[PDB]
């Protein structure tokens, strides 16, 4: 009732915030990530390297969020930790996020999302592209919210399902507020 | 020579890492790692640290692979994933376990060695986030640096790239020698005014 109506509202706000961030990224000359470092790499190699890195970066951040929300409830067994992480980084989950954000086949969608995450993070380290790091953080947060909401509806933990859904929804609502306010401050510059 | 620097490097890595680890063991926060749970079927906190340490090692290793290989366009992408796999695989983590004498080298299983290394990494990182135990974060970084150095030295000697074998090995050896100075220096700082 309250959670399923909020979940629908969350998907709209996530789309709006992520679309707004990404629309300003496409104004940046650095946006074509595959054509950088041309004296040292190629388009195909950049795509594999960014996907290589994005894979591990997503994996680490997803692991951190699983711990963040599940360790509070001792009723939850360790199977759900690995279960949730697997559910969060699998290509089907990433492809759903691909579709929700209208980024553009099963396997390609996940690879593209991973390459985008990794490319954005690496760009923010090698250039000034703090907007690109903001997008990667918000994209992973939306990936975790999307995954965990689905996962805990299919695999409700003992007694605390609605409370941990509320924790994740409250957390993600605050992140969306933070990402929105960061975007306006960066764009009101 | 590079191999003279290598054998000296393994002496210094053992001493720095053992020196940091000895200070961590004096800290009451070390108890929370529950490394005893490596022998137990009741090993929830140990598995959770291992769960996270696995991912943290993967990301840091990925970052180090990109760091050294991307300046060499001679090196194809297959060596990026080849080096990462060689670095995080259970066999490499076991060799580090044995090099540091973390536990018994015999009545302590092969996969168990890699799991303990991963759990120790994860627990240290989580302790630094939750308890501001910066010495534990220093150790996690130093341990992964040694893991990468040890792995990269063996990998590129076994799989020499085109033209640049010696140059990339010099790159990694010089870097790790600088890290060892940094970790030694950071430790001396910490132990005189924590
Ligand atoms: Mn990958
Ligand atoms: Mn992939």
Rounded distance from Cα A85 to ligand 2 centre (Å): 15
CA nearest B6: which of B121, B140, B173?
Answer: B173
A90 C-alpha to center of ligand 2: Å?
9
The one-character DSSP state at B31 is G
Half-sphere exposure of A49 (CA within 13 A, CB side): 32
Residue B151: HSE in the Cβ half-sphere, 13 Å Cα cutoff: 27
Binding-site residue set of B for Mn(2+):
50, 54, 115, 118
Q: Taking CB atoms and an 8 Å limit, are B56 and A63 in contact across chains?
A: yes
Residues of A (10-39) whose Cβ lies below 8 Å from B: 37, 39
Give the angle B60-B61-B66 at the CA atoms, nearest 5°. Answer: 100
Q: Tell me the nearest-neighbour CA distance from B7 into chain A, angstroms.
A: 31
B109: helix, strand or coil: coil
CA distances from A179 to A30, A59, A96, A184 (A): 21, 21, 21, 9
Nearest to A52 among B47, B80, B126 (CB): B80
Output the CA A118–ligand 1 centroid distance in Å.
Answer: 10
Query: With the C-alpha atoms ordered B126, B132, B135, B137, is the resulting torsion angle positive or negative?
Result: positive
Across the interface, do B62 and A85 touch by the CB < 8 Å criterion? no
Neighbour count for residue A105 (Cβ, 10 Å): 9
- Nearest chain B CA: its distance from A58 CA (Å): 9
Distance separating the N- and C-terminal Cα atoms of chain B: 38
- Give me B32's structure tokens: 């929370």
> From the DSSP assignment, how many helices (H) and strands (E) are in chain A?
7, 0
Neighbouring C-alpha atoms within 13 Å toward the C-beta of B111? 1
User: What is the rounded CA–CA span in Å between residue A64 and residue A176?
Assistant: 18
Find, among B60, B66, B171, the residue nearest to A123 by Cα.
B66
Ligand 1 geometric centre to CA of A87 (Å): 16
What's the resolution in A? 2.0
Q: What distance in Å separates residue A187's CA from the closest CA in chain B?
A: 30
Three-state DSSP at B137 gives: helix
Q: Which residue has the tokens 């929105």?
A: A180
* Ligand number nearest to the C-alpha of A91: 2
* Ligand-binding site membership of A51 (annotated): yes
Say if residue A4 is exposed, middle or buried (CB neighbours under 10 Å; 0-12, 13-18, 19+).
exposed
Experimental technique, in short, is X-ray
Q: Which residue has the tokens 């060892």?
A: B180
- Under 8 Å between Cβ of A93 and A87: yes
User: Are residues B14 and B99 in contact, defined by beta-carbon separation less than 8 angstroms?
Assistant: yes
Q: Relative to the alpha carbon of B62, which ligand is closest? A: 1
Q: Is A64 on the interface with B (CB under 8 A)?
A: yes
Is any Cβ of chain B less than 8 angstroms from the Cβ of A73?
A: no
Show residues of chain A in contact with B51, CB under 8 Å: 63, 66-67, 78, 81-82, 85
Contact call for residues B62 and A56 (beta carbons, < 8 A): yes
Q: Taking each helix axis from N to C terminus, what angle separates A130-154 and A161-187, rounded to the nearest 10 degrees?
A: 160
Please answer yes or no on whether B56 and A52 come within 8 Å at the CB atom.
no
C-alpha Rg value of chain B to the nearest Å:
17
Query: Buried b / exposed e across B167-180, counting CB within 10 Å, b at 16+?
Result: ebbebbbebbbebb
Question: Which residues of chain A are within 8 Å of residue B62 when distances are taken between CB atoms?
Answer: 52-53, 55-57
């Amino acid at each position: 009732m309250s959670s399923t109506t909020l979940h629908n509202a969350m998907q709209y706000t996530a789309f709006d915030v992520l679309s707004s961030i990404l629309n300003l990224m496409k104004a940046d000359p650095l946006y074509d990530l595959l054509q950088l470092n041309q004296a040292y790499s190629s388009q195909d190699q950049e795509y594999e390297k960014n996907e290589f890195y994005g894979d591990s970066y997503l994996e680490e951040r997803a692991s951190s969020l699983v711990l963040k929300f599940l360790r509070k409830y001792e009723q939850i067994p360790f199977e759900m930790y690995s279960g949730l992480r697997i559910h969060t980084v699998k290509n089907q989950t990433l492809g759903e996020i691909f579709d929700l954000l209208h980024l553009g086949e099963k396997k390609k969608k996940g690879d593209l999302v991973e390459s985008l995450i990794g490319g954005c993070v690496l760009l923010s380290q090698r250039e000034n592209a703090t907007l690109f790091l903001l997008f990667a953080h918000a994209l992973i947060d939306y990936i975790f919210y999307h995954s965990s909401y689905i996962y805990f509806n299919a695999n409700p933990p003992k007694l605390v399902k609605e409370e941990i859904i509320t924790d994740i929804q409250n957390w993600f609502k605050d992140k969306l507020f933070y990402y929105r306010s960061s975007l306006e401050k960066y764009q009101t510059d």
